[PDB]
Amino acid sequence: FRQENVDDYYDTGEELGSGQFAVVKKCREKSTGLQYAAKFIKKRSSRRGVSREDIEREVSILKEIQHPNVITLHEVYENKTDVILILELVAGGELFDFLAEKESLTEEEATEFLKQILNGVYYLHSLQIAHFDLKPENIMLLDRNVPKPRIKIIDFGLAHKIDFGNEFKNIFGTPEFVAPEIVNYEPLGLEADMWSIGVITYILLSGASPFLGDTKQETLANVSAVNYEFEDEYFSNTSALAKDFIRRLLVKDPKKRMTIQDSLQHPWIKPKDTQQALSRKASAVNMEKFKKFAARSVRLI
Ligand SMILES: [Mg+2]
């Protein structure tokens, strides 16, 4: 990690964000004039700060990843109190906020945006990296003011390189979005991201959250038992192909769940014939419900 003062290389401005042991400022690199985001992460052994091990794992994954749909790490600095990630400036806001500004969305147009999400995940999974926190607030746009906005997956704070010879178990993430193996403290791997893609998709089409209960206890029980329905109220204009794609992801047994590669060949994403393309063209997002959803931190432990 770079030992120089980040201020010698960057001018820093306004706060873009803050979470528990971090703050994000917009910054401009002095030698090039280009803008980035600088995330200052408080170093911890002490119940304040992020552990060295977690900081290093997240940085080691960011340094590896280079793909148009995943946020890029520029440089990393360190002083006595922080680690500072200089990151690509991802300034278009959340995908669902952007989609909720539109009047309508066919299933065909929704798959367009989903496909960029699938391609970023396809790349991560091909490097044996599980993201482990896929949910709408981690799916952003690079710049909303262009003909075809680019999706960026962000926030690799929970990402792990999958180790063939050693099971990984942990309890983390947001209850609405975590796979049953996370709720049951079972072996975790790439499949958990696939389940969360199923949840993002179900919400994208309906504006409803599939497993959400009135309490945290109920949500977790719903997740663990895979207890969800496609209610007519929300899903009466959704194609059978959509619902099949979701059904193939929201699967208790991780070995039976569709993989990223399968997902990208699914006929709802890649129709094999005219009939399938027409079925997709005839269905559309429940935009009135989806707008309420977009207009509405939360942790497993
Ligand atoms: Mg986030």
Residue numbers in the entry: 4 to 47, 51 to 302, 308 to 312
Task: Copy out sentences from the published article reporting this entry, exactly as the authors wrote them.
Members of the DAPK family are generally involved in both apoptotic and autophagy pathways and share significant overall sequence similarity with myosin light chain-related kinases and triple functional domain protein-related kinases (Temmerman et al., 2013). DAPK1 and DAPK2 bind Ca2+/CaM through a closely related ARD, which is inhibited by phosphorylation of an identical ARD residue Ser308 in both kinases (Shani et al., 2001, Shohat et al., 2001). They also contain a basic loop (BL) in the kinase N lobe next to the kinase active site, which has been identified as a DAPK-family-specific signature motif (Tereshko et al., 2001). We found an identical type of dimer arrangement in all three kinases that involves the BL of the CD. In terms of functional implications, CD dimerization in hDAPK1, hDAPK2, and hDAPK3 is likely to inhibit catalytic activity by directly occluding the kinase active site.
